[PDB]
Amino acid sequence: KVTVTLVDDFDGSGAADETVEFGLDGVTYEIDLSTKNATKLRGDLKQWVAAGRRV
Amino acid sequence: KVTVTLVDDFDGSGAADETVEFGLDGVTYEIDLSTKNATKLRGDLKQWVAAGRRVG
């Protein structure tokens, strides 16, 4: 049978739960992640977003 | 005398050497940083940029 799977781009393992959008140096990215991993990515950006300012 | 200086936003006690643009969840951000802290920022996103896909 044909199986279509949404795979977590970061640890390569499982049913990814969400796609997160993010950016650096004017480049925009998208990434498919488990709930756990998207929490991890937002966690890594937390301190820079706080110190930074919205444009 | 008056002094005008770019101060590192992250720790607040240093001359910023550069301004870095980044984004999360549709929102775009700017931050002024020392060369060192700019390296830390880019370092924190490195694994995520690597696994992610560039879009418009």
Author numbering:
A (entry chain A): 4 to 58
B (entry chain B): 4 to 59
Sentences from the study reporting this entry:
Lsr2 from M. tuberculosis is a small, basic protein (Mr = 12.1 kDa, pI = 10) that is highly conserved in mycobacteria and related actinobacteria.
These crystals contained protein truncated at Lys-4 as a result of limited proteolysis using trypsin. We then artificially induced this proteolytic processing by adding low concentrations of trypsin to purified N-Lsr2 before crystallization. This facilitated crystallization in a different space group, P3121. The dimerization and the linear oligomerization of N-Lsr2 is identical in this hexagonal space group when compared to the structure in the P21 crystals. The linear oligomer strands lie side-by-side in the monoclinic (P21) crystals whereas the hexagonal crystals (P3121) are made up of stacked layers of linear strands that are rotated by 120 degrees. This provides further evidence that the tendency to form linear chains of dimers by processing of the N-terminus is intrinsic and not a crystallographic artifact. The hexagonal crystals have a higher solvent content (70.0%) when compared to the monoclinic crystals (38.7%) and there are pores running through the crystal lattice. Intriguingly, these pores are of appropriate dimensions to accommodate long chains of double stranded DNA beneath the N-Lsr2 molecules as well as the Lsr2 C-terminal DNA-binding domains adjacent to the N-Lsr2 molecules.
